[PDB]
Structure 1
Amino acid sequence: QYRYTLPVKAGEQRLLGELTGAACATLVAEIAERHAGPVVLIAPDMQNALRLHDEISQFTDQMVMNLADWETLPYDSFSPHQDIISSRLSTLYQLPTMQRGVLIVPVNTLMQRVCPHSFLHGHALVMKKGQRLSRDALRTQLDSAGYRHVDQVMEHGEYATRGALLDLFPMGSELPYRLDFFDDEIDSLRVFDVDSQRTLEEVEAINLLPAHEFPTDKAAIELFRSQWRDTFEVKRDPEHIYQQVSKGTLPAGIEYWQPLFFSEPLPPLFSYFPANTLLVNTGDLETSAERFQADTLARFENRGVDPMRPLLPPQSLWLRVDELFSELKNWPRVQLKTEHLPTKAANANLGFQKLPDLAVQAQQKAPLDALRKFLETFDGPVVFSVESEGRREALGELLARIKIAPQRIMRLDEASDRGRYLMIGAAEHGFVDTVRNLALICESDLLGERVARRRQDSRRTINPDTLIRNLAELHIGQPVVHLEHGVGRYAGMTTLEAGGITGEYLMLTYANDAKLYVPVSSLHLISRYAGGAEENAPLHKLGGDAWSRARQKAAEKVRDVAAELLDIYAQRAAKEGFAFKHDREQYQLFCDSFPFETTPDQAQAINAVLSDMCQPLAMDRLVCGDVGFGKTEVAMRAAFLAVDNHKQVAVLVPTTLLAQQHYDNFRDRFANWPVRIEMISRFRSAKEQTQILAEVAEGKIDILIGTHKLLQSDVKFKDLGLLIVDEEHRFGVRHKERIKAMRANVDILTLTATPIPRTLNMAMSGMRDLSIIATPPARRLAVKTFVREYDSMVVREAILREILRGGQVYYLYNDVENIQKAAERLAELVPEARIAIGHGQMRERELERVMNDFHHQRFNVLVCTTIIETGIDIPTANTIIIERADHFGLAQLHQLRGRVGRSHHQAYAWLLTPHPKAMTTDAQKRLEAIASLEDLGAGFALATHDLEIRGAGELLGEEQSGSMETIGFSLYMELLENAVDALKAGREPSLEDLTSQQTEVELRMPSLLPDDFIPDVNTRLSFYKRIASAKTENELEEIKVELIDRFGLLPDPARTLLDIARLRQQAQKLGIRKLEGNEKGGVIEFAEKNHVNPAWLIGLLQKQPQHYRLDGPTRLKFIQDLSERKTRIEWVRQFMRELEENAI
């Protein structure tokens, strides 16, 4: 027995109470199971409907299905994307006889009118083999369809019923079909010829649906025109929809002139309902129907202008709320509402209390305190409802911390009196079902809230040294403090104009005589001086010296990159690769876990990657494929091959949010195989990194996803076997090579969508392989690009079109300082939306929360910078709005456009531009190019367009994109071959090895052999090797004299390099482990067994307190006026010598 009775009568209601969040789901599951007939869930808004479509399906198994609505807005200008109609009609054809299941409609669709009968049981036929129907029923329905009984069916509108076999020549196609009803059932779908009557194919289910929502044939066009001349007025213009339809074409938003085509009023959709449904509500309807009617009326009057393209009244294409509640008194109804309903029949209360304070945080030494104390005091069962599959493991290793191991159940009524279970679904909030004592603890009840940004005391001081009461009496020349800019000199009253207002101002002279005028209405921002130096007061510069001091830096080309890159590649080309082992079935299971199908180009790229990894050479492959084509699953099916040989994949992504997304996706995909995946970035705190690094070094973590924090010289993999650069049109060069440098024979799998020109040319010349991806995966539609001048009405219409569909919006802004004001302005413009700010300059525990909540639909619009430029998935987001698209690269614009789409929904992307009197010519060229290439597979064409204009940079340097007089590939292969042969023969270690054991004497003062001095990169590299490997000062001097002979005078960088290597030679023998230097001083880092006199050390400290300070066990900070580099060098050498004479 159950808790309450369902109603079965005309329109009697049942109010259910107290059902808190994600309990509407379990009630509708219970109702759908206990009811002998359909259940129609009338959600309050499409958003909720979509959410319910995922929640309900978790708690039962009846066919829960939506009703795919036109994703346009009322009286919009876009077509409903014909695929949608192919699923909007089919539902309607089954709806008069569905015998079980749940149909979810919002009131946006519920208030709409739909095709009114006839046309459906006239222009369609859906029939599967499990249609238990007779012959003469089809006979009379085709009779009503107007088909003629022809024994030799050859043309449209013909049917036959002879013996046991039934024939049709349908209105839609040109093929007749044989049916073969047996025993009140259909048994065959024999595609037989127009005349020969010979079966071509036997099928099980047939679909002949009209590809337009309204009839399109000539008679219906004439009817449309006649109704038009009845109601509207025809104007002579080749764009008026009267002449557009008459000429045969269908305009953009033609679906909103639906009722004209039919000459019988559109039925209110309720005629399509079965005999005995049971309308289950959610929230409220007599509040959301009214809101939608008001918005529809607003759109009708808004667009009830424009004599071109006129509109029907909303009564003609929508139910009026009065009619809608005339009809919801014609169905037996159950309302699920979250509040204590008092007492009566047709009313009931289901005790569904909210969960207690469940939250965790790393602040307490016991983080799992709320849960550990709740799960002992709970007599009932507890079901944990984790979100995905992989998240189970991310929740399975967290409840192991308090000795709770959850079984996995399938249906919620498998719970005991006492047990912990978890189930996988999409529920969003918990509940303590105190009726049957059970509890559901959704994963969003373990991550309660974030409460930081609680600040620090005092950002202002009031009435101290200078009250600043200021009834003006100040003299002229008297120093003054502005709170924001510092000390200036008050230079009198003045009068000014400011664009329409004449005001009085105070006159303040800062440094360089740059004057600041402050209003007299706001003189309280100004205080008197306090240092007691009214004659010795300083003077700041307004606006700082950021612009001035930024040119102080550079021009020394402190490091030569050609030698390093040549040595990296030369070490690469020498070592034999690893030839992975491939297990057929043990990778077949990994393939079977993929819930999709590999398109015949993705399965070609995957096969190439595997057959390249299983070769004795070293891969270097680019997987350039257009955005959203499933490039990442190539990385996973290569990562499985790698780590199945115990080989420590390392995935490298160029931003934090992409790192978090890839961490979640990899835990999802590797959710059963014993490979421990971890992510290292700036999200992970310093007590998590210091454990992840220890794990990696010991070799237990087997996939490590990281931002640039990965390549920071403290990350030592045990057995690295595969490197997956993701979104490599970033990273520069040194970041891409900094992981290849430590392990040469590693395999690199370089994933990108628009490769940056250097690594596109270098793929087009054979240095790397290339495996393009085309054939967009399943149901992707090319994103529609629109380029408009910025307009608040355009923004509002775009946002509402997306939101009332239920999706989400990226509103890309790309200016951090003004993004707060931009989000405020947006939230005042569109009150209907929910808006959050996302950019990579927050406290990062706020960015975690923001992009988590975005993934869980807790807000719609995300005002964001270009941190979302790198492959954030979010398959619901289907509208990007680029605020200022004029300054963005072609590759940048393509990646931003690729964020939307990602699923079967047609997704628009707007590139708002400033008004064209201030856009450069190159900007309109870029924008017209990116709007032209609005198709699929456009990524690689755009990349090879960006190359060829930008031109590939140095093949053996930094600076990926630019002409800039590279070295030739034909020269480069010869140079590399010479390096390979000298290296292998010689067997010298890599330059990086000479960097590894190098006692660091980073004194950040240039040290290299200049290019003109030794032009041959190979020979210069040989001197690098022989210098840094010189282990005697005599050997260094022999190098010096040989280099003097072979190339004359020694430039300053060269001789400094020699002296620095000398100091290395000395300090490694001494016990100095890392020595520094700078303009103002430096630090010397000793080893554990050093040759430093500690008595002399304390002597240094106590006779020079202004020069020597110990901060650390071996960190001896020295400070000296090292304003000349030569003085710096002599200082450090003399320091060491003074140490070595006292060495012990």
Structure 2
Amino acid sequence: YRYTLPVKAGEQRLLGELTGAACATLVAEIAERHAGPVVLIAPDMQNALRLHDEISQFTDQMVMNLADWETLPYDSFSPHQDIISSRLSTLYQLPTMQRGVLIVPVNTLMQRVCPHSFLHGHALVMKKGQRLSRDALRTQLDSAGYRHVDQVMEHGEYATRGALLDLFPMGSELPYRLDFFDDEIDSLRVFDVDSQRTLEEVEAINLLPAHEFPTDKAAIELFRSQWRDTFEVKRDPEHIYQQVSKGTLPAGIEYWQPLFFSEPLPPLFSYFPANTLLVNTGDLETSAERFQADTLARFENRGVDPMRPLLPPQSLWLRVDELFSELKNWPRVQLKTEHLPTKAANANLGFQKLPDLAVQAQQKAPLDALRKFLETFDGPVVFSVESEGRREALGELLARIKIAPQRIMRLDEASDRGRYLMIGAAEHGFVDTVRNLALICESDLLGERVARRRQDSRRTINPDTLIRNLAELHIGQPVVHLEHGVGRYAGMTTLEAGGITGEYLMLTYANDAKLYVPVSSLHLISRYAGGAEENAPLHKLGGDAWSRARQKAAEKVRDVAAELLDIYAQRAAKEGFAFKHDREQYQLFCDSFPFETTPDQAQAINAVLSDMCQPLAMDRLVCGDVGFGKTEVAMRAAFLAVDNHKQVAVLVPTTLLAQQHYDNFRDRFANWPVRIEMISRFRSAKEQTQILAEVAEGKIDILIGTHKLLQSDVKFKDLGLLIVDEEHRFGVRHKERIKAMRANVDILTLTATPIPRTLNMAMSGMRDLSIIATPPARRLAVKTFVREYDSMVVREAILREILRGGQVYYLYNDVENIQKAAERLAELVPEARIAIGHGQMRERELERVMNDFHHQRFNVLVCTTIIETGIDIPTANTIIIERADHFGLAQLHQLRGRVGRSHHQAYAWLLTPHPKAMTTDAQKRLEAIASLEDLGAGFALATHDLEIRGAGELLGEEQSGSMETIGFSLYMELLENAVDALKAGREPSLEDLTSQQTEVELRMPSLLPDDFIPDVNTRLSFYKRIASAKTENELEEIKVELIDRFGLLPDPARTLLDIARLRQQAQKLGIRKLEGNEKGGVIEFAEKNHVNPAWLIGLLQKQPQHYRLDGPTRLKFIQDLSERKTRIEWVRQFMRELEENAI
């Protein structure tokens, strides 16, 4: 083309006049036309990710990025070993590959690596036709460094179960099972982390060492030798020398890598193929050197703590001059967006930048510049769309500009006068003047719409995965056995206690008195919820305290049972309501919203709209973190409410945020004809009466106000929608007082963080719940600083935000000394313009200075906790508090996250009085809030607050209490028992808990042996599932799953399955208790059985000696069933024949 290609160690090519996103075009071109692999060096790893898209967007050659360590140099955490997988694979094949593009940032090119002899000297291949021992391969894996686990879920672990060994290779992404057979590899089956069954069988597998360093005995001794040669040992049970010598691995041990090879580690340059070409963008002569400075700076910063010392930086990272010399050994190309006219191997190819093409909604012709420029472009114009649906979203836009470009795949496909489009993540369009090509990106006109996972992958907390993290069976966590009391779970054990070895779950009580409970009676154990995992009560066994507490609870539930019998339903007398939504009308309202919702916001919208469309009323928690645009869900709910004209009301515990919602709703409905108004202290009673009259006649649909409505004064013609914000700070019977008016109203519970009782109820599932863990695009984190009382940090932070041009939120929490403090901090900060705010003011100047804050005429505001509700403006970007000894975690997090709603990094300066003046609980609160600082932190903080404040009375008042109440589920058990007492009118009795659906014990061992399943959690899960079976199809699929996950089925397993099947069939039949032994047994029916009495008596008289009706419902039979198989077959055929003549 316009230039040659550089192939020489010293050859350097330099290219200029290269606009943004044309670097990708040039890179793809040269890689496709370069006879050899391509390695690209990027200045910023994040930028490299961007490259990883656009390159793959424009070409089809395999493009990969060097997996890199996430942690900062000399950190105290592992590199998140999963990433290591993606690394090692690329390392293993790296020498042997001809075409392909590998992209690396300089910060990781700076890092030393393994010698690859260590790598491919340990690179095993397992093949079908191999007579290899299970144990030999086991020890082989152990030497390789794979970790022995029992429920493999991650990279680099292996588990065993009888003849079935399974593991996860470090190179591939899916684990594998083997199915050994006579020490022969019979199968090699891939299986998902959650299917635990075959997806397919592959002929052979290749596996790589577990880590980036050996871990055999030779490795340990070499490491110890190097250590004793270099550093100084400390005789200590956590000094990494002793910890390594023990056998384990320190968390950060990966940074002490050069102590494992007795060699200078390669600079990774040896791994380049014999014929490569370096291509470089930006510049390294600043990035690499600044990185070296940062590494040494952090090193010297942490040159303390003799336990866990640090290597010199030069031993692990390279030198800059050495890096330059090394790169001068390969041909290299450099790209920059400047003018280099001198002289050869240096060109300036026409890649003009995109002109100012954009769309303006206010203009009558948004695509004015677009249509002006399209017709002035003689060449083809090709658009790029980052997704699929958006393509149509822009095709309609092209219909507004009356053009239908054809979708192409490659840039060369463009004709002379051709308009086209393609799916790509390109950022900036441009004008390739070489052949007059116009490339257009979405941001060219749309602007900023970013949906990538900008946040760190590890920096995420899934709510459902947090519940599934564990809900049972932690070896120390407490549980409650309703018969006796509360203890700590300790595990499983098999016991021979009557000639049949049965499983038993063992609990421990006070004074170390153990209690084993049979596995079958599992439904008598509840997971503790009193929230005292470290200070919980420990009932001493055989005491009356638990019985007394249970009797008190029984009395309380009987009282509330009468109360519910007043309603004559289990909160079920309600029929609800159905809303009608017009999809086009709602879509029009979506159009009136000038934003794009996050995916979880869209999910919440779908859930709420569907639920209201259902003919039942809602009680739905939308508990997401602040700054997630929760209010817009309410806006759309109110729009659909006014579509039905259902007189929606809204509640908030303040006047500031009430006014905020008022103006927001006015903005949403300044185009839609509908009446929005407010009723609170600000309004005069003269107009409050008018508001009440208007809402009595129904001329008002949207009302915003505080507790004035729940004063038996407001009248609604048709109250159909009620909204509540910030459920916290609300006492009980507020919701009951607002519910009393109309039962079938849709309840929408908006909040930022639930109080412990509400959170526990959400966990119970009795109330609908929803979480939005998807922050807006530009909502970066909020910095937090827990500092002691310094008068200078506050002043300098105030000045830092003033020079930024923002507003400071000053918290002192006083209505007397706030006056003096305002002038005190004015003297401290003469540059500051301050207003005084407190809730004990006439509210006229309050709203006036709120308006002033909207205009930002004064910078820092002193206020009490009325600020907590929050009307945050994006201008405000910093909060300094004064009292940090008494504030709830919910308030702390809420005021932390209240700042932002903008692209600019906010701040949260936290001022504390003397540490010794702090009580223990204050220290715990402050250390907890400091420990967590990231997006999606409110929900996890609420989970932590659970077990701290403790869920309160699930029945009585005073929520969020840590009293000694019975757990959660037992309350529901007694409630349904009393509902039975009401429906059947039966007497209250503590016997329904002592339940018995069907007992089919026959003195025959039946259990899931631990050898057949290693762990206990899965064993108990299957125990519960089998106990709660409903049809023989369930049993069949369970048997299939057991076959998959654990191979063959032991005799006890088969017996358990068939006993469950027989219990199922007997429950279908109508018999309740079928018992027996070797010499015979008894059959006992129900009150209304379905066995034919005629033939029943016929059998009775046919063989009275072998059959005797001894009791109103008891049939005694004698049988010589010395074989378990004979016993089971006899009973099966007996019951089958009995039910054959079923009446």
TM-score by length of 1: 0.48
Seen in structure 2, the aligned counterparts of structure 1 residues 511 and 294 have a Cα distance that, compared at 3 Å, is same
Please report how far the alpha carbon of residue 547 of structure 1 lies from its aligned counterpart in structure 2 after TM superposition.
54
Q: Output the CA distance in 2 between the equivalents of 1:806 and 1:987.
A: 72
Question: Would you say the 8 A contact 2:127–2:205 is kept in 1?
Answer: yes
Seen in structure 2, the aligned counterparts of structure 1 residues 942 and 315 have a Cα distance that, compared at 3 Å, is closer
Question: Would you say the 8 A contact 1:122–1:144 is kept in 2?
Answer: no
Please report how far the alpha carbon of residue 622 of structure 1 lies from its aligned counterpart in structure 2 after TM superposition.
3.1
Please report how far the alpha carbon of residue 440 of structure 1 lies from its aligned counterpart in structure 2 after TM superposition.
2.7
1:497-521 residue CA offsets vs partner (Å, 9 max, x unmatched): 9999999999999999999999999
Q: Determine helix, strand or coil for the equivalent of 1:558.
A: helix
Please report how far the alpha carbon of residue 250 of structure 1 lies from its aligned counterpart in structure 2 after TM superposition.
2.8
Please report how far the alpha carbon of residue 342 of structure 1 lies from its aligned counterpart in structure 2 after TM superposition.
1.3
1:773-799 residue CA offsets vs partner (Å, 9 max, x unmatched): 999999999999998879999999999
Q: Determine helix, strand or coil for the equivalent of 2:399.
A: coil
Q: Determine helix, strand or coil for the equivalent of 1:397.
A: helix
Question: Would you say the 8 A contact 2:529–2:951 is kept in 1?
Answer: no
Seen in structure 2, the aligned counterparts of structure 1 residues 93 and 869 have a Cα distance that, compared at 3 Å, is farther
Question: Would you say the 8 A contact 2:778–2:902 is kept in 1?
Answer: yes
Please report how far the alpha carbon of residue 826 of structure 1 lies from its aligned counterpart in structure 2 after TM superposition.
21
Q: Output the CA distance in 2 between the equivalents of 1:346 and 1:726.
A: 66
Q: Determine helix, strand or coil for the equivalent of 1:1135.
A: helix
Aligned position for 1:111: 110
Seen in structure 2, the aligned counterparts of structure 1 residues 1067 and 757 have a Cα distance that, compared at 3 Å, is same
Q: Output the CA distance in 2 between the equivalents of 1:125 and 1:685.
A: 83
Seen in structure 2, the aligned counterparts of structure 1 residues 1117 and 772 have a Cα distance that, compared at 3 Å, is farther
Q: Output the CA distance in 1 between the equivalents of 2:159 and 2:470.
A: 104
Q: Which moved more, 1:69-78 or 1:960-969?
A: 960-969
Question: Would you say the 8 A contact 1:160–1:166 is kept in 2?
Answer: yes
Question: Would you say the 8 A contact 2:1072–2:1086 is kept in 1?
Answer: yes
Question: Would you say the 8 A contact 2:1081–2:1116 is kept in 1?
Answer: yes
Question: Would you say the 8 A contact 1:480–1:488 is kept in 2?
Answer: yes
Q: Determine whether 1:145 maps to 2:130.
A: no
Seen in structure 2, the aligned counterparts of structure 1 residues 393 and 616 have a Cα distance that, compared at 3 Å, is same
Q: Output the CA distance in 2 between the equivalents of 1:253 and 1:152.
A: 25
Seen in structure 2, the aligned counterparts of structure 1 residues 317 and 419 have a Cα distance that, compared at 3 Å, is same
Question: Would you say the 8 A contact 2:502–2:1005 is kept in 1?
Answer: no
Seen in structure 2, the aligned counterparts of structure 1 residues 462 and 155 have a Cα distance that, compared at 3 Å, is closer
Q: Which moved more, 1:711-720 or 1:478-487?
A: 478-487
Seen in structure 2, the aligned counterparts of structure 1 residues 437 and 725 have a Cα distance that, compared at 3 Å, is farther
Please report how far the alpha carbon of residue 55 of structure 1 lies from its aligned counterpart in structure 2 after TM superposition.
2.6
Seen in structure 2, the aligned counterparts of structure 1 residues 1117 and 186 have a Cα distance that, compared at 3 Å, is closer
Q: Determine helix, strand or coil for the equivalent of 1:219.
A: helix
Please report how far the alpha carbon of residue 95 of structure 1 lies from its aligned counterpart in structure 2 after TM superposition.
1.4
Seen in structure 2, the aligned counterparts of structure 1 residues 160 and 903 have a Cα distance that, compared at 3 Å, is farther
Seen in structure 2, the aligned counterparts of structure 1 residues 331 and 817 have a Cα distance that, compared at 3 Å, is farther
Q: Output the CA distance in 1 between the equivalents of 2:929 and 2:443.
A: 40
Q: Output the CA distance in 2 between the equivalents of 1:1086 and 1:818.
A: 79
Q: Which moved more, 1:747-756 or 1:73-82?
A: 747-756
Aligned position for 1:437: 436
Q: Output the CA distance in 2 between the equivalents of 1:719 and 1:411.
A: 60
Seen in structure 2, the aligned counterparts of structure 1 residues 62 and 980 have a Cα distance that, compared at 3 Å, is same
Question: Would you say the 8 A contact 1:14–1:335 is kept in 2?
Answer: yes
Aligned position for 2:765: 766
1:1109-1131 residue CA offsets vs partner (Å, 9 max, x unmatched): 99999999999999999999999
Question: Would you say the 8 A contact 2:604–2:622 is kept in 1?
Answer: yes
Please report how far the alpha carbon of residue 351 of structure 1 lies from its aligned counterpart in structure 2 after TM superposition.
0.8
Seen in structure 2, the aligned counterparts of structure 1 residues 875 and 352 have a Cα distance that, compared at 3 Å, is farther
Please report how far the alpha carbon of residue 999 of structure 1 lies from its aligned counterpart in structure 2 after TM superposition.
67
Please report how far the alpha carbon of residue 981 of structure 1 lies from its aligned counterpart in structure 2 after TM superposition.
25
Q: Which moved more, 1:792-801 or 1:452-461?
A: 452-461
Question: Would you say the 8 A contact 2:156–2:210 is kept in 1?
Answer: no
Seen in structure 2, the aligned counterparts of structure 1 residues 828 and 676 have a Cα distance that, compared at 3 Å, is same
Aligned position for 2:187: 188
Q: Output the CA distance in 1 between the equivalents of 2:115 and 2:845.
A: 51
Q: Output the CA distance in 2 between the equivalents of 1:348 and 1:677.
A: 65
Seen in structure 2, the aligned counterparts of structure 1 residues 227 and 667 have a Cα distance that, compared at 3 Å, is farther
1:316-350 residue CA offsets vs partner (Å, 9 max, x unmatched): 21122222222212333222221122144422221
Q: Cα RMSD over matched residues? A: 30.8
Q: Determine helix, strand or coil for the equivalent of 2:293.
A: helix
Please report how far the alpha carbon of residue 43 of structure 1 lies from its aligned counterpart in structure 2 after TM superposition.
0.4
1:651-683 residue CA offsets vs partner (Å, 9 max, x unmatched): 999999999999999999999999999999999
Seen in structure 2, the aligned counterparts of structure 1 residues 464 and 6 have a Cα distance that, compared at 3 Å, is closer
Question: Would you say the 8 A contact 2:531–2:950 is kept in 1?
Answer: no
Please report how far the alpha carbon of residue 123 of structure 1 lies from its aligned counterpart in structure 2 after TM superposition.
2.9
1:1043-1069 residue CA offsets vs partner (Å, 9 max, x unmatched): 999999999999999999999999999
Q: Which runs of 5+ in 1 are unaligned?
A: none
How is 1:477-492 mapped onto 2 (pairs within 5 angstroms)?
none
Question: Would you say the 8 A contact 1:955–1:967 is kept in 2?
Answer: no
Please report how far the alpha carbon of residue 152 of structure 1 lies from its aligned counterpart in structure 2 after TM superposition.
28
Seen in structure 2, the aligned counterparts of structure 1 residues 528 and 783 have a Cα distance that, compared at 3 Å, is closer
Q: Output the CA distance in 1 between the equivalents of 2:545 and 2:104.
A: 58
Seen in structure 2, the aligned counterparts of structure 1 residues 499 and 1019 have a Cα distance that, compared at 3 Å, is closer
Q: Which moved more, 1:482-491 or 1:140-149?
A: 482-491
1:806-838 residue CA offsets vs partner (Å, 9 max, x unmatched): 999999999999999999999999999999999
- How many residue pairs match? The answer is 1143
Q: Output the CA distance in 2 between the equivalents of 1:617 and 1:892.
A: 34
Please report how far the alpha carbon of residue 109 of structure 1 lies from its aligned counterpart in structure 2 after TM superposition.
0.8
Q: Which moved more, 1:1024-1033 or 1:379-388?
A: 1024-1033
Percent of matched pairs sharing the same residue: 100
Seen in structure 2, the aligned counterparts of structure 1 residues 1052 and 841 have a Cα distance that, compared at 3 Å, is farther
Seen in structure 2, the aligned counterparts of structure 1 residues 192 and 688 have a Cα distance that, compared at 3 Å, is same
Q: Output the CA distance in 2 between the equivalents of 1:815 and 1:933.
A: 28
Q: Output the CA distance in 1 between the equivalents of 2:1062 and 2:147.
A: 103
Q: Determine helix, strand or coil for the equivalent of 1:422.
A: strand
Q: Output the CA distance in 1 between the equivalents of 2:211 and 2:958.
A: 54
Please report how far the alpha carbon of residue 113 of structure 1 lies from its aligned counterpart in structure 2 after TM superposition.
0.9
Seen in structure 2, the aligned counterparts of structure 1 residues 548 and 346 have a Cα distance that, compared at 3 Å, is farther
Q: Which moved more, 1:48-57 or 1:990-999?
A: 990-999
Q: Determine helix, strand or coil for the equivalent of 1:1118.
A: strand
Q: Determine whether 1:1075 maps to 2:1074.
A: yes
Q: Output the CA distance in 1 between the equivalents of 2:1077 and 2:986.
A: 36
Q: Which moved more, 1:1044-1053 or 1:420-429?
A: 1044-1053
Q: Output the CA distance in 1 between the equivalents of 2:1039 and 2:190.
A: 91
Question: Would you say the 8 A contact 1:237–1:243 is kept in 2?
Answer: yes
Q: Output the CA distance in 2 between the equivalents of 1:133 and 1:1062.
A: 40
Q: Output the CA distance in 2 between the equivalents of 1:531 and 1:1099.
A: 59
Please report how far the alpha carbon of residue 915 of structure 1 lies from its aligned counterpart in structure 2 after TM superposition.
6.3
Question: Would you say the 8 A contact 2:40–2:278 is kept in 1?
Answer: yes
Q: Determine helix, strand or coil for the equivalent of 1:330.
A: coil
Question: Would you say the 8 A contact 2:380–2:437 is kept in 1?
Answer: yes
Seen in structure 2, the aligned counterparts of structure 1 residues 904 and 745 have a Cα distance that, compared at 3 Å, is same
Q: Which moved more, 1:533-542 or 1:611-620?
A: 533-542
Q: Output the CA distance in 2 between the equivalents of 1:89 and 1:465.
A: 32
Seen in structure 2, the aligned counterparts of structure 1 residues 567 and 615 have a Cα distance that, compared at 3 Å, is farther
Seen in structure 2, the aligned counterparts of structure 1 residues 910 and 365 have a Cα distance that, compared at 3 Å, is same
Please report how far the alpha carbon of residue 71 of structure 1 lies from its aligned counterpart in structure 2 after TM superposition.
1.5
Q: Output the CA distance in 2 between the equivalents of 1:39 and 1:468.
A: 46
Q: Output the CA distance in 2 between the equivalents of 1:274 and 1:1037.
A: 55
Q: Determine helix, strand or coil for the equivalent of 1:326.
A: helix
Seen in structure 2, the aligned counterparts of structure 1 residues 785 and 260 have a Cα distance that, compared at 3 Å, is farther
Q: Determine helix, strand or coil for the equivalent of 2:210.
A: coil
Q: Output the CA distance in 2 between the equivalents of 1:477 and 1:139.
A: 31
Question: Would you say the 8 A contact 2:119–2:209 is kept in 1?
Answer: no
Q: Output the CA distance in 2 between the equivalents of 1:691 and 1:604.
A: 39
Q: Determine helix, strand or coil for the equivalent of 2:608.
A: helix
Aligned position for 2:456: 457
Q: Determine helix, strand or coil for the equivalent of 1:996.
A: coil
Q: Determine helix, strand or coil for the equivalent of 2:466.
A: coil
Q: Output the CA distance in 2 between the equivalents of 1:1087 and 1:644.
A: 55
Q: Which moved more, 1:379-388 or 1:107-116?
A: 379-388
Please report how far the alpha carbon of residue 287 of structure 1 lies from its aligned counterpart in structure 2 after TM superposition.
3.1
Question: Would you say the 8 A contact 1:129–1:204 is kept in 2?
Answer: yes
1:121-170 residue CA offsets vs partner (Å, 9 max, x unmatched): 12344899999999999999999999999999999999999999999999
Q: Which moved more, 1:935-944 or 1:29-38?
A: 935-944
Q: Which runs of 5+ in 2 are unaligned?
A: none
